[PDB]
Symmetry: C3
Subunit: 195 residues, 3 copies
């Protein structure tokens, strides 16, 4: 009565209630707190902290920077591999995630905000299908290189699967004489909604 509300705040004299007006397609209320409808979350390898990946059961290794960007219900997966050995024929890199929480078991990953800071969010938003019966494989063209010099044009396979209640992303690069040094990216869908 003896105060007013500037938009987006509103007062209703009928029920004596102060409210926040918001556009529902962009923002929403979640357990009584304001949230976004389509927030951006990134589960990534930390700054300057690549993950060490093993080629199958061999004692061949590579350093990987990984970003997993959630927008809407899409996950954009991006990996920047860099091995020191000149590999074999096909090589198999495997990321393993907890099937309930999404936490990377293979190596250290963090939910990072735009502030730079680590967010206290369980990374379930990277999991496809809450039901563990997922299909999705595919190929992507890549370029093996070294010291900023072109080596090969070739391809990289990807596959998403569940085994023993754990989510796997399995990449199959096919080099021949070159080292496994390449960036690749793909998109997939997460049925798990962000609450």
């Amino acid at each position: 009565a003896s105060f007013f509300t500037a938009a987006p705040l509103s007062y209703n004299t009928g029920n004596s209630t102060i409210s926040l007006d918001y556009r529902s397609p962009q923002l929403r209320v979640s357990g009584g707190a304001l949230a976004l409808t389509s927030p951006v979350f990134v589960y990534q390898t930390p700054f300057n902290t690549p993950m060490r990946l093993r080629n199958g059961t061999y004692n061949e290794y590579a350093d990987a920077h990984i970003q997993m960007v959630r927008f809407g219900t899409t996950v954009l997966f991006n990996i920047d591999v860099t091995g020191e050995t000149n590999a074999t024929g096909t090589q198999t890199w495997e990321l393993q995630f907890d099937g309930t929480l999404g936490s990377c078991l293979t190596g250290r990953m963090q939910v990072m905000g735009g502030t730079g800071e680590e967010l206290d969010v369980t990374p379930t938003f990277i999991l496809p299908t809450s039901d563990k019966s997922v299909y999705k494989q595919g190929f992507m063209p890549i370029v093996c290189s070294e010291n900023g010099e072109f080596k090969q044009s070739t391809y990289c396979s990807y596959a998403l699967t569940y085994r023993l209640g754990n989510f796997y992303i399995t990449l199959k690069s096919t080099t021949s004489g070159c080292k496994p040094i390449f960036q690749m990216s793909f998109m997939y869908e997460s049925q798990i909604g962000i609450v």
Copy 2:
């Protein structure tokens, strides 16, 4: 003065007795008196496990397509995951048709999906380039035809955005030779239509 206080981001001004929300204008804004984002993310996509059936020109070759169209800022990221059963030979033409005023996919069912998983009641105009119909964005993208998780071909896929008869078209021209049309591809384009 007042018999109450305001924690940030709420503020009280004792001069005009008014409660406000303080917000950073580059990130948030007010739109018809309601709070909104400056650069919201919207996705117009094929529904979960509900691919769209596309036909290759007038031929009896078909393909199932999952499609995502992600709006950030004024950029649209278009992603398609095709999978055909016939082995095509030569170039094949897949064509998506959208309403030129509303953006609604006429070719098959698509929905605006939020990050919650829920369908949003939003007209998909945010996927339209150039308000009113003189667009000429085309390009090529390299792809990999495959089958049963086994490598077939490295090849290319053309894309073109056009208007015809007040309708927005996205036309993809994959050039396989012996392989089935099975590939993911993605490109970015601009939408002049602001989300205001």
Copy 3:
């Protein structure tokens, strides 16, 4: 003698009205509401491509450029289109201020989803505030013309600092085709939007 509807809350202990928000998605920044992971796009303006020169040659190209910040990731996308038929490798170079991020090569703007220009210093496009280690790489591309296939080939990218300025240097290798291609890559920005 008033109530608060969620997400507004009243605490009778300290007589204080608050906004409840989920901290992973929203936050307070100098007392104002903001996003945790806002989307910012530093781009060439609508219908305003940037004119790029191939080294010291009198060969030019028009480039549309988007630099999309999500979290701490920058997605870089360029759509080049030249009129000359180059032969051999060609070098396109984008130059940005190393402290502010402002494109020195040509006009770029922070554009919101509304279409409007945002008054934001484009520091969010800068990788590593003190030079460091990463981001040279290659990406496969397709040279074309008039919507007709020319070449499958490759494009190099490199992020470097020289004289306190951030450079993005693309090295397309055509051999008779015009330089007409889209390419995109991702990199990390240590500079937090705070």
